[PDB]
Structure formats: C-alpha cells, structure tokens
Amino acid sequence: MEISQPSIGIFYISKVLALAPYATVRNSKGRVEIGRSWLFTVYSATLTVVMVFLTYRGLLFDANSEIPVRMKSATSKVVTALDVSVVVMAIVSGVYCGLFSLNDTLELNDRLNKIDNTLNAYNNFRRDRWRALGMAAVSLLAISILVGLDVGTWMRIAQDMNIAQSDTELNVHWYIPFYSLYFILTGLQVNIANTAYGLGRRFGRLNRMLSSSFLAAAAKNKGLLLKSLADSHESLGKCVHLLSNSFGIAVLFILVSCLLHLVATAYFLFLELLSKRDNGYLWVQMLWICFHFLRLLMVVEPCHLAARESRKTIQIVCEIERKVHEPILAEAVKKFWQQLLVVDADFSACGLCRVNRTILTSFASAIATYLVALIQFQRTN
Amino acid sequence: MEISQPSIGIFYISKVLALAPYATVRNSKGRVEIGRSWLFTVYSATLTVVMVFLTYRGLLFDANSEIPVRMKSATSKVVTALDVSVVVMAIVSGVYCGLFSLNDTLELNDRLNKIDNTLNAYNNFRRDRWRALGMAAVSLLAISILVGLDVGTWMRIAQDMNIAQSDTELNVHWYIPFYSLYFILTGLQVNIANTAYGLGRRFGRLNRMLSSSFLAAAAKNKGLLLKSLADSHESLGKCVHLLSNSFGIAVLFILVSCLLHLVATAYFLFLELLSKRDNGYLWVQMLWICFHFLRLLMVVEPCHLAARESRKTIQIVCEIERKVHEPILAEAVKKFWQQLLVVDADFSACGLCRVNRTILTSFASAIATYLVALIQFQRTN
Amino acid sequence: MEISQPSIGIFYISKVLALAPYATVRNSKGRVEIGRSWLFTVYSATLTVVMVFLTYRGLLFDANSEIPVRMKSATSKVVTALDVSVVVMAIVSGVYCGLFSLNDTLELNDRLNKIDNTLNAYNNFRRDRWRALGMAAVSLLAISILVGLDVGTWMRIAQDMNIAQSDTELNVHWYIPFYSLYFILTGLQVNIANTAYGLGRRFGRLNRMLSSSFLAAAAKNKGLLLKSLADSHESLGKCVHLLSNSFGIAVLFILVSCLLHLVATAYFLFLELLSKRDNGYLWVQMLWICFHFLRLLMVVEPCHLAARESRKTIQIVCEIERKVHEPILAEAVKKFWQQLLVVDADFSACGLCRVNRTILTSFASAIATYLVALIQFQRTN
Amino acid sequence: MEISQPSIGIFYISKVLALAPYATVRNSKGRVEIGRSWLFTVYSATLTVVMVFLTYRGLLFDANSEIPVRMKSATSKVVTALDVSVVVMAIVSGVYCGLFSLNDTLELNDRLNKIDNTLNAYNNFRRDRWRALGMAAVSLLAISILVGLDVGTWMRIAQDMNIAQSDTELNVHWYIPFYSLYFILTGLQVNIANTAYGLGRRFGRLNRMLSSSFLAAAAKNKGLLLKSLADSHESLGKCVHLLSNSFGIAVLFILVSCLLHLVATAYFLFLELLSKRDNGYLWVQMLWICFHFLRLLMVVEPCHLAARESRKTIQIVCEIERKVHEPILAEAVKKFWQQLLVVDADFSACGLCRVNRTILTSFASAIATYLVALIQFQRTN
Ligand SMILES: OC[C@H]1O[C@](O)(CO)[C@@H](O)[C@@H]1O
Numbered sequence A, B, C, D: 001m002e003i004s005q006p007s008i009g010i011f012y013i014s015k016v017l018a019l020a021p022y023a024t025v026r027n028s029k030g031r032v033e034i035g036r037s038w039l040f041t042v043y044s045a046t047l048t049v050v051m052v053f054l055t056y057r058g059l060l061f062d063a064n065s066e067i068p069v070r071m072k073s074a075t076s077k078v079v080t081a082l083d084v085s086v087v088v089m090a091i092v093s094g095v096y097c098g099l100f101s102l103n104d105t106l107e108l109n110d111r112l113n114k115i116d117n118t119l120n121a122y123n124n125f126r127r128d129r130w131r132a133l134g135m136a137a138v139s140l141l142a143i144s145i146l147v148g149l150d151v152g153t154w155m156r157i158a159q160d161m162n163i164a165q166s167d168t169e170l171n172v173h174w175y176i177p178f179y180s181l182y183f184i185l186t187g188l189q190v191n192i193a194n195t196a197y198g199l200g201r202r203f204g205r206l207n208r209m210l211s212s213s214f215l216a217a218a219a220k221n222k223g224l225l226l227k228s229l230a231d232s233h234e235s236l237g238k239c240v241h242l243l244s245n246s247f248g249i250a251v252l253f254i255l256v257s258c259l260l261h262l263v264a265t266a267y268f269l270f271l272e273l274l275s276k277r278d279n280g281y282l283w284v285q286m287l288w289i290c291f292h293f294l295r296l297l298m299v300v301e302p303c304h305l306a307a308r309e310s311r312k313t314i315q316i317v318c319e320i321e322r323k324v325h326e327p328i329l330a331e332a333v334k335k336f337w338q339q340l341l342v343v344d345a346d347f348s349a350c351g352l353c354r355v356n357r358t359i360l361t362s363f364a365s366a367i368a369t370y371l372v373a374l375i376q377f378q379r380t381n
C-alpha cells in the first residue's frame, strides 16, 4: 500500500473506513513515517465485524419479515444473499490485508521514496494530489448517488407493497449496513487503484527518463544514472510484488464481486424489463452495471498499465545497446538488459489469475454463460 | 494505417466511407504526404452520427409499426437489436480510430517508406496495386450482392405479411441505413486487412532478403545490409504496434460483431429450417454466415501471418550465426539475435486478446455455447 | 510425410487408400526415392470424390426412405449427418494434403536420411518395421471389427423395423461408403502417427546419443559429433514443421471428428441406455467411444512426445556446459544452447491449436458441455 | 516419493494403506535404505482389488435392493456411481504409482540426501517430523470424523425408510468399502502433499541460503558453495520431475475426483435444501465440501509453492551478479543464471495440466457450469 503526502487524502479515507489502520507523521523533511495504530486497528476490526453482523441481521430480518422486500423468492433470496456476501468478503479481505500489511507498506513506501528521489525531475506534486483527490471524490460521489437512488427506489417499492398490517420501510432501513459495506469497498478499491496507478506512472516516468537521457567523466555519470534507473525498475517490480502479496486476496474478492454483481444486476434488470413493472428500478440497475464495470476497470487497468510500462523498457534498453559504444556504459546496459529479461511484471491475485485486460474477456464469457443459465432457470420456473 | 500509392484506392474508399479523414498529396518523388483534412473530418463525423441515428430510428419504427417485419418477437427484437448495435459499434470505433490516428498514420507511413527503400529489390508496385484493388472490389461486390439479396428477401417477406390497412415495405426501406453501416464496416475491414497484410508481406520480404543475402570491404557492406535489415524488422514491429494502438478497439469490435453475427444468423437459419417457411431466406442466411466467417478471417489471418513471419527470422539469424565467421558481421548478427529475442510481434486488440488463428477456435466454442443456449431458449418458449 | 523402407507397408496402405499418391523406388543404396505418381494421384482424387458422393447419396436415401433406419428423427438426422460430415472432411483434408505435399515429403525424407546416418548407432530396422506393421494391423483390425459389429447391429435393427411393404436392409447397405471412409481415415491417422512417432523417436535417440557421448585431436572429433547432433536437432524441428505445414488441416479435422464422434456416440449410448431397447447396440457404442479415444490419443501423443523429447535436450546441453572445459567444444555447446533456446517444437494444426496432451482436457470440457446440452435438449423434447 | 526418517510415519501409513510397497532399513548413518517388498507389493495389489470389488458389489446390492438407500433415482444412481468411481480410480492410480515407482523413489531419496547435506544448516528434524505427523493425523482424523458422520446420517435415513419386509441398514453397511477407499485416498494425498511440500521447503531453504551467504581463498570456497547450491537447485527440479513422472496420473485422478465430488456434493446439498427434509445431512454435505476443497488445496498448493520458490531464485542470482566482482565467482553466478533461465519448475499431471493455483479458478468455472446444468436437469425432471 502507498501512503504519500499527495495521496494522503485517500489514506485518510481508507483509515476512517477501516482499511488503513496506520499512524502517519510527516517528518520535517516532507517524508511520511508510518507505524501501527492499535486504536485504529481495533476500530477497523470492530467496525468490520459489527457492520457485517448488522448487514446479515438485516438480510435475515427481510427474509423473515411479514412482507419481504428483496428476499421474497428463492431465486431472489439466493441472488441477494450472494450479492451481500461478495461485498462482505471483499471488505473483509481488504480489512484483513490492511491489518496485516504494515511491513509491506513500509517497504513499499521506502522503495517509492528512493525511486521518487531518482525520478525527481518528473515528479508533479500538484497533479498527483489532484488526480488522487479527483478519483477519490468521483468514486465516493458515484457510490453515494447510486446508494441514494437504490434506497429511494426500494423505499418506493416497499411503499407500493405496504399493507396496513405491516411496515416494509423498516426492511429497506435494515439494508443501510450493506450500503456502508459498499462505501468501504469503494474506499478499498480507490486505495488499491491509487497504489497501482502510482506504480504504473513511476514505470512510465522511468521509461521517459531512459528515452530522454540516452536517446535524445560524463560517461561515468551517465552510467551511474543508468544504474540508478535499473535499480528503480527492480524496486518498482518489487513494489508491485509487495502490493500483490498484501492485497491479492482483496483484489481476487473484488473481481469475484464484480463478476457476481454484473450477473445479478443484469438478471434483475432483465426481470424488470420482462415485467416492465418499473422504470426507475431499470435505470438504477443500469447505473449499478455501469458502476460495477467501472470499478472492474479501476482494479484491472492499473495492473495492465504497470505491466505494459515495465515490459516496454527492454526495447528502450535494446535501442540504447544498439546506440551505445562506451565500454562501461555498454556493460551497464547489458546488465540492465539481462535484468529486464527475467522480470515478473504481471500482477498476481494470490496466484489464481493474472490481473490484466484479458480477464475482462473471460469475465464477459462468464457473464454470458451464467446469466443465460439464470435466464433459462427463470423460464423453467 | 497504411496510405500508399498502390493502395490509394482503398484509402479513397475509406475516405468517402468516413474512415480516412486525411488529405494526401503525391510529391514529385512519388511519396504520399499526409495531413489532416478538417472538411472530411467533419464529414466523417456527421455522416457516422446521422447514419447511426437513422439506423436506430428505422429500428424503432419497425418495432413500433402496425406489422413489424423483423422486430416482431421479443427474441427476434433482441437479436436484431444486437445485430444492429454490433455493426454500429464497429463502425463508430473505426471512425473514431480514423479521426484520432493521424500521428500513428504518419509514423507508420514514414517507417514503411524507409523499409521499402531498404527492401526495394522485392517491391512489386503492379502486384500490390492489383491485390489491393482486387480485395477491395471483392469485398464491396460481395457486400453489395448480399445486401441486395437480403433486402429483396425481406421485401418479399413483408409483401407476404402485407395487410390492406398497413404498408410493410416502408419497414424494409427504413433498414437501408443498416446496410450503409455494413458498407462502412466492409471498408474499414478492407483498410485494416490491407495494412496488416502489407506489414506481413514486408516481414516476409525481409526474411527472403535475409535468406538470399546470407544463406545463398565486402563484409563491411554485408554488415551494413544486415544492420539495415534489423532496423527494418524493428520498424515493422513498431508499425504493427502503431496499427494496434490505432485500431485495436476497432478490431475488437469487429471480432465481437463477427461472433454475434454468426450466432444470430445461425439462429435465424435454424428458425427458418425448423419452420421451413422459406428457402431464399435460408440461402441468404448461409451467404451471411459465409461473409461473416470470411471477414473474421480477413481480420485474423493478417495478424497471424505478420507474427509468424516476424517470429521465423530468429531461426534465419541462428543459421547465419552458425554460418558466419567474420568478426564484425558475427557481432552484428549477435546483436540481431538479441534484438529478435525480445520482440512483441502478436497483434493486441486493446489488450483484451491476441489476434491470431487461435481466436477462431475460441470463437467456435463460443458459437457452440451461446447458439445452443439460444436454441434451448427457443424450445423452452 | 515419412516414407521409409521399414514403414513401407504403411505407405502402401495409405497409397491404396488414396492418401499417398507417390511412386517410390528403392535405390541400390537402400534409399527410397520418391516422385509424383499421376496415375495414383487421379485414382486418389476420383476415389475420394466417388466415395463421398456415395456416402451422401446413401445418407439422403436413408433420410428419404419409407422406413429410415438411422436418419429418423430431427435430432438423429442432424447427429448422423454431422457424424458422416466430420469423417468426410477428415478424409478430404488427408487426401488433399497427400496430393499437395510432395515437396514437403521429399524434404522430410532427405532430412530423415541425413539424421539416420548421424544416428546410425541407435537405428533398429527390425524393431521399427515391426512397430509400424503392428500399429497398422491393429488399427485396421480394430476398425474392421468395429465396422462389422456396427453393420451387423444395424442390420438386425433394420430387420426389427422391417415392414412387409418396404426393405430396410438396403438402408444399411447404403452406409457401406461411410465405413470405407472410416477405413481411409484410419489409414490417414496411422500414417500421421507413424511419421510423428518417428520424429519423436529420433529426438529421443538424439538425446540418448548426447547423454552417452558427453555424460558417460579427440576433442575435435567430439565437437564435430556435437555439431552433427545440433544439425540433426534443427533438422528434426524442421521436419516437424514440414509435417505440420503438410497435414495440419488434416490433424485439425481429425481432432474435430474425434470430438464430435465422442459427443454423438455418447449421446446415442445414453439414448439406448434410457430406452434399454438393445444391448449389443450399447456395447458397440462403447467400442466406438474407445476407438475414438484411442485414435485421439494416436494423433495427440506423438506430437506431445516429440515436443517433450526436443525440449529436454537443453537440460542435457546445460549439463554438458557445466561439465565441459575444452575451448572449441565449449563454444560448440554454447552455440547448441543458443540454438535450443529458440526452438519451436510444439506441433501446430494450421495455427488453430497446439497438439499436445492439454487438448485432451479441453476436449473433456467440450464433451462435458455439448453432451449435457444435447441431453438437456432430449429432455426438453 | 519421499521416504525420510522425520516423515517415516507417513510412509508407514501409506504402506499399511497399500500405497508404499517398500521395505526401509535405517542405516547406522541415519540414512534410510529402500528396496522392493514383494510381501507388501502383493498385499497392496490384493487389498486394492478386493476393496474395489467389495465397493462395487455393495453399490450393485444397493441398486438391486428392495429399498435402495442411495442408489434410488436415475440421477442419484449416476451421481453416486460417479462418486464411487472417481475414488476407485484415484486409489487405483495411487497404488499403481506406488507399485511401479521404486526407481524414482530411490533416485529422489538419494538426491534429497545430497541436498540435505548441502542444506544441513537449515534442517529441522523435530519441526519436519512434527509437521508431517500433524498433517497426517489431521487428515486421518478429519476423514474418520467425516466418515462417521456420513455413515450415521445414512443409517438414520435408512431407518426412516425402513419397512417391515426389508432391512435397509445392510445397504449402508455395504458402503464401508467406499469409506475404506476414502481412507486410502487420504493416505495417498497425504504422501503426495508431504513429498511436494518437502521439495518446496527445500527450494525455500536453498533460496534463504543463497540470500544469506551472498547478500548479507575465501572466494574459492564461496564459489564452491554457489556451485553446490546450483547443483541442489537442479537436483530439486529433477526431484519434482521424478515426482511428476511417478504420481502424475494419481494427481490427475485426485483432481478429477475433487471436481466431481464438489459438483455431486453441492448437488446433493441443494437437493436436501430444496426438500428441507433433513439438517444433519445438509451439515454433513457442507463438511464434505470443505474436506474436498481442503484436499484440492492439499494437492495444489505444494506444487504452486515449489514452482514459486524455484522461479524466484533467478532474481537472487541477478542481484548477486550485480553485487559480485570476483572473476571466478562471477563466472559461477553467470553459469547459475544460465541454468535457471531454462528450468521447468511447474508440476505436470501426465501432461494434461500444470498443477498450480490457476487450476482452482478453472475448477470453479467447471463447478459453476456442470452444477448449474445438473440443477437445470433437476428442474426439467
Ligand atoms: O442486485 C442489483 C444491484 O442491487 C445491489 O444489491 C445494491 O443494493 C447491487 O449489489 C446490485 O448491483
């Protein structure tokens, strides 16, 4: 996990959302020293447990109420239970990763500080801060608007199904914990995306520096710069590996949540489109599909960009080789080429899969297979 | 995108079809200088928007008519809507790529000019021009014949379903925009195929030159020739990467369109074969299947050939190494081998997949899975 | 294609079966010179066309008879038509490959002669001849027994369905061409398996020679032997590539035929097991499943073995490097290691897939997917 | 297969379970010499045959009884038959591997002895013995508890279905052989997991030794140590290959058994959850699902860990290269890097698949596809 001053807002968001139980102090040098915060550790654990318990209690209450709102039919019951469980698992994995990833965070931040010192010429504090804050604000505003629309639609629906001998508004009220879990999930995804995008951006800056310092006494300093760039590349690869070892289970559960959410939301939209019983519900389902796809991209695109930027440095090094005649510089470039030959750049989600754009294709196939089956089941019943 | 004098006819076809908004002037040296053409840029954008709007308006009119011709049943409505939407997305992606790919086109054409100067001995202006014109004419004639057959069959069908209190011929007339979109798609596919086949042909010419100049004072010029060949190989790889970065979304949407078209056309053919209500409709559906498969091959085979030709140069270089004793020539061949070791030859469609013949197998599986399901749905209903 | 004296029996079998239209003369040196045989070329083409026409004519006659035997229901009609068409396509592809693969055959046989001269110490004429004849005899006897069982079972069935106003035995008689196509397919598969197994066996002999001459004046001859072994390895790789370029479409159609045959035969067996209307039919279906799986292995295992044997030579070369101190021998071993680093050993079926054991797993999944669907369709109807 | 004094308990368990027909004598040096034990060879073969025959006889008796307990419906009959057959095949493959893998076992144990002598500094006899005994005891206790729960639940069920004119308790008694087969399968899986985890642990110890002896006269001994470490790495790779060549069919059948068991157990749990006819049966089905998933991990995680540990040594070697200046040590590290460049670390199950965590994802998809279909079939019927 990345904790930097420009992105300190995302860190605070994750901290109040039970995902970053760390205490950060800004040194007089502008560096952010990080340590364990037991107060926030226990706060995060207790909040996660309490919110999960409340979410499942509300689910049971809806299922066991006089007039269930969402948990009405067996198919609807199972689909909504899976929808809640995927979010619960994703947030639990994120919280667990944030709790037991302090050493990885420290190592990643030290490596990033060294790399930024190496790549100080391409650092943009203002632009990085604004990008991080914009991404966080957009994600939070989108999820807030979507939650408001969903809760209003479900409130209106429950009012339509209201009977004088029972209150169905409380059934919708009891689903608030699920939306809180959604906010926590949004914060976790924002943090992961920020870290991965930072790694990819640093890879791109390293490649730009390589191409601008070698393709556009003195040779000794140039070789020193090349050695520093190679060290930065290896350190960025190790930072990617640390991010994987820390949040791979979280990313895997986020991907599973995206898949199941797309399937279930498409199924519900198809149901409402066949019955044509409501229109706001249909539009809210389309908005949910768009949000789920956007967050799937949020978790996929960063790793793909990082791998792409890291794997294109070898071509630059080959060009340098073909355009370098100095002995020691040629040897340094040869060392860099050998180092790049054996880089593991792709992001691994606990070894289950490689997080890149190809996953999307697979997802589509899965969404094309399960959804249809669900439609077939609906026709059968 | 490739814009060369031999293939200038394909460029003009794409230009009048809203896919190549570029102004080309032939220099006194025989070179084609390319620049932005704002008149044709706005013409392409406006034509694309207007034709898409007309296509969807005709779709809605058919769906909302007294006697729908194609958009009659829910299954038929959805299938025809997807059929129109895939074409719309493919042409929109092609137009967008042509609008925002001027720099890539310029770089690709400069690289191709340099490579052709390097490989001037194997250039065939007459044969290249005739191949390009033949491919373009065959594609346009096939799509025109297919559109005529489809529109005539649908006109006859609508006449069969005609009732004295409504006109169903106008419903078929309103589908003309969809066929115009088909023509635009054919032009885009022809342009992409021409560019990719040119890249693969240049790879093959480079390999032939390598095998004929090294396996079938003077050594200094031979090493110079080898350096030029290696530069041409790297430039061809970069041209493939430019073509990908420019038209990957277009190729991905073309592949999706081919998949969904094969599925839907097979479903319609199966419907008519069960009902046995018509024969010309069945034959037109078979012709559509053949056309879709042929264009899928048109978009797949070029990339596969390019990758195959680029990946077989390393064996030639190894043979040269084993058959070269000169010091400087041996060093140049070693450099070439190292360069070839790390080439990314496969064509990437926005990173979602690698465009090669293997895709076809996957496609078959997909076509075997979805189609069957659709058949199962038909049986259920 | 391989044409050697030990395996000349397989060549003659393929020749009388319209798959090897070549004239072979044994030189006084024991070498087999190969040339085009126009008499057998036209014989093969005419026989293939005539047998395909007769097979489809018998299919139509069964479908259009008073009491169809096999082509009775729409599902049965489609399944039997696909069963006949896959065999027809496989044999047509094999015949086409044999017709237009004379140059590849000549090159492969020259390369194999050179390799055998290099590996003369491990050549076993008697064992190779006996293995080839045993494989051919086993395949032909198995297909003959299976055809006899199938035709007898279908004759008995047609007698059971016989009515005084029609003869159903002629319907079974008209399916003889399909069994002739099966014999041709068996011959083609035997030839392909013999060639691929020969390539893999030569790879294994090369590896054994490497391990016995280097891991178990004089150094100059040892380096000469190593150079010959490296040349033999590259020549075996090129022979594999020639076999692919010649019979890849045939192997692809054989794989498709195996897949569809397994699916259809399992479906028919499941039908008869639900109806429990016959027992000999069930056992014949199990025998057909076993034969199809055995020939799938016959076409898969050879390529897998060849790739495995070719890819394990690099480890032997690394051991030699770690155990070689001589300068020129060390340089030769380094050259061999570099050559082995970039070998394309896997067999490619026209680029659609890599023929190895992994395919089997995919096949299973496919057989698990389509078959079930077919069962689901049967339940629906 | 690994046979070491710390894990001698697992060896004895496998020996009395018909999986390790070897006689082991502990030498005065503490080494375990291994040889063939014909008494235990015939005991293992006879026990396997007898238990398989009894299992299938009990299956038939249940199917042919007055009141079948498990083999009642066609769907239930097929599912239970497949459940028994997968276990039978897995245990038969394990027994066959143990019978015909004496040479591989001897080679693996010699290699492991040499490696342990090389890595003596990181050997922990007490910890290894306790881990092996704990894994064996946990597996055996879990399977025993699960078998007791299953047999008690089925006994109670058969008592519920008891009629005065027939005894259904004997039907459950006749399924004891299936549980004995389950115990044999658990022993085989424990042995395979122990061997693979030992290989991965030795890989990790080798990497730790590399990082602690090079990254945390004398140079000659350091190079000797590096040569020994490289030899140990190659020997561990060859040990992994021996384990594959010996037990790949067993691992493949174990994976198939896990897949089919998960599918069938989930189907049965879904059945009981729809009928809601019992609760203990539901909980036993959940326990069975957990046990099957845990053993799938038991067979997958070891190979993944071994490959991961073996593939991360190249990065350590690159760091050593970048941090080594001595001539002979630099040459040794270069040799080690070249050796590591071409390592085949992944475990292969007879070439059908690579055993790693990715398989799990595929499994899920399969479980998501077949299970649903089975549910669809249940709805249809
Ligand atoms: O199920 C449809 C949508 O409703 C939600 O549960 C929100 O309450 C989302 O998880 C899903 O996208």
Ligand SMILES: OC[C@H]1O[C@](O)(CO)[C@@H](O)[C@@H]1O
Pocket: B083, B150, B261, B264, B265, B268, B285, B288, B289
């Ligand atoms: O749907 C069957 C065929 O009809 C078309 O829509 C043409 O109007 C094609 O897209 C398709 O191949």
Ligand SMILES: OC[C@H]1O[C@](O)(CO)[C@@H](O)[C@@H]1O
Pocket: C083, C150, C261, C264, C265, C268, C285, C288, C289
């Ligand atoms: O269809 C079941 C079996 O019958 C055959 O058609 C033989 O006539 C085979 O192709 C198939 O294995």
Ligand SMILES: OC[C@H]1O[C@](O)(CO)[C@@H](O)[C@@H]1O
Pocket: D083, D150, D261, D264, D265, D268, D285, D288, D289
């Ligand atoms: O089928 C459900 C469960 O019952 C068993 O057969 C045990 O007797 C297991 O193989 C399976 O997990």
Ligand SMILES: [Ca+2]
Pocket: A369, B369, C369, D369
């Ligand atoms: Ca499926």
Ligand SMILES: [Ca+2]
Pocket: A376, B376, C376, D376
């Ligand atoms: Ca169905």
